[PDB]
């Protein structure tokens, strides 16, 4: 393919060459951004940025800007050129719209498809994320179609596809790849066990699990891998409005797809943008026509490093800590979900602790988790000792019976996919007449 | 491959030839599947157009028995997508498609007499979970360049309140949802402060399927949404779209893409027209060949020419709504009741109802706002007296009884798993965040 117009891993031999692949797109990107009502209004009465050098002066685009411009204030092409329209997860009251041409979709699908394990025609790919307005289900399906994998559209949060039916599909279709968030990986494992199947042995064709959408510690990621037989759990970082911006290498670090976007770290205190360090993730996608974004702040706290990785990819690594501002403090001690997660998932695998939750009170950390009765007291004691050793916070830890946080019906209930029925026989329950879901 | 378009045939004889010329390929493809290889093991299988007249019907129970890949005629490497049918979960029905199979599927859906255009914004409000329906409409929208808004259905992510907001704010021009969902969206619109007959000026057509739909109900759904076309099609997960509405309001069989026959289940005879069970042999599919697949829907196929000038037979689908219940001296079909319910004046706003056939009496409930309820009860009773003569027990209910207010107004944030909460936060959304 002498013919392909977007860069691939291996097209650049140095960071200087990568920087050139980026800057050579900025005149097109800056001209396209100005066609949107939002950027045309932003630079009204001034000379707009046109050149690679002008980009250093470009003002950040905030989430609140995208919400204020709902639905099509960020639109730079005729609506006739849109292929799909999406809205972000989170608050329903203040939606964020994103939208993509067919050519925009090719870039999106390529970035998702950068899975170090490969996606092949030989694969059966269960897409277990939502298709309702959000991009995630559509994105995985598009990458599956691109690479010829058989796509099984599992959807998520749909009454049509409960966990019991997904477990049966995983086993009976010999599914080789999955796409779902890390909590859904443990939900599927709990559903398998409730169906009398061992996730570590009874799914021999499952070769990788693709995941995103949650901050994921290496301790949790490795436990999720071990639960499913030691297979790779392949993380990516993305959003509805950016698509996939980073993907895992074989060493287990996420690398920024810097050939497809200019990535900057925003220090909200000084207002400076830097190519690496700690701060808020800023993205300028290079290969989109419909919805240009100039220095869009995802407002995730990230650590970007240019330090080499054992994978040898010539791309910076990124750790995603969480959403900016989300931390809690109890003693002098900062309590992060990420620190608690590392302690919970360091309990021996034999204790089967997967489901937990915690509440920061001013004085004390309240934490609950499900564990089988025989190991429950051990789990409470060891997790307490871990909190003492690592954080020194006062705690109130309660072990719960399985079925308490995650009900049995979520794991085992089957649901017929009915249609509206208006006339029933005497013996039939007519309660499913109009509300048939 | 080269697939026919409306207008490629000038007569029924030419249509019959477009079909028969595909049958050698279709019969050889079917034989590659374990199911048809086993069916014709130790015989000479059918090879020619003439041999097709002798081909045994394929039943739904065959597709269930062959779960998952007994109907598969290509290497799995060539599959693009895998689907399972709606209905019983305990006994799944698998279907699957190559990329080229998908082009035929998308083309058949896209035969919408109103057109699908790049100028369109197309809300897909059917499920994407395993079933084909959401994927099919999305594929046809992508094929014709319409902006696809993936609404999904039966998803906690996309309640009615949010779909009504999307209809209005995105100037949606086309919808895809079942006929019950058309009335659910109308009730949700009023609950959002929007009049379905006036406040959606860019909505130009509503595409629908999946339910038996009387012309009386279809015309009422049109009137509720300001007199815009309600464009019906007939399909299934295992066949795709097999008939679509013409501008005269009849569904025409897509006979250029499939051989349609009417099955008498008592004699087992197959006829090109008349009353009986819908039998389909798709002509342009490689992955999952079907020879005379019996959808087991009760249909009436007619060869009578239509004012639309399409040279294709028309089909009415009675289905499960065609099957009588004896009550009084009389026999009552869902389709006959539906015609009487939707013959009540539009201004009574009767959209949601249900009925139970007892041996002695028809029990029927419907929502009607105060103060038209007792008029509606009386007129519907008189209609049942005049038309059916069945004893009835009719109850008018307050709106919010059959279709709860919560279904129409509830908004739901799309949350992710959260493990650490502040004191004042509800931590019940920790692991069960849907
Ligand atoms: N691998 C990851 N690690 C950590 N956080 C992640 C990861 N992937 C996604 N996220 C988080 O999820 C966000 C994107 O959520 P997603 O639903 O995929 O898009 P969205 O529709 O923009 N939702 P939202 O921003 O939450 O309103 C990112 O900004 C991060 O906060
Ligand atoms: N226009 C229509 N009029 C009447 N019935 C229809 C119409 N369209 C679809 N149907 C019914 O819906 C069935 C197909 O349901 P659908 O969910 O679209 O496919 P499926 O998931 O394959 N279901 P099934 O094969 O019956 O188990 C048809 O066989 C008919 O019974
Ligand atoms: Mg368009
Ligand atoms: Mg394949
Ligand atoms: Zn690496
Ligand atoms: Zn016609």
Author numbering:
A (entry chain B): 0 to 436
B (entry chain A): 3 to 436
Show sentences the authors wrote.
We reconstituted the biosynthesis of the benzoxazole moiety found in nataxazole by adding two enzymes (NatL2, NatAM), to 3‐HAA, ATP, and Mg2+. We have determined the structures of both NatL2 (homologue of BomJ) and NatAM (homologue of BomN) from the antitumor nataxazole pathway. We show NatL2 catalyzes ester not, as previously reported, amide formation; the amide is a shunt product. NatAM catalyzes benzoxazole from this ester by a mechanism that we propose involves shuttling of protons to control the fate of a hemiorthoamide intermediate.
The β‐phosphate of AMPPNP interacts with the side chains of Ser87, Ser88, and Thr239, and backbone amides of Ser88 and Thr239, while the γ‐phosphate has fewer interactions making hydrogen bonds with a water molecule and the side chain of Ser88. There was no electron density for bound Mg2+.
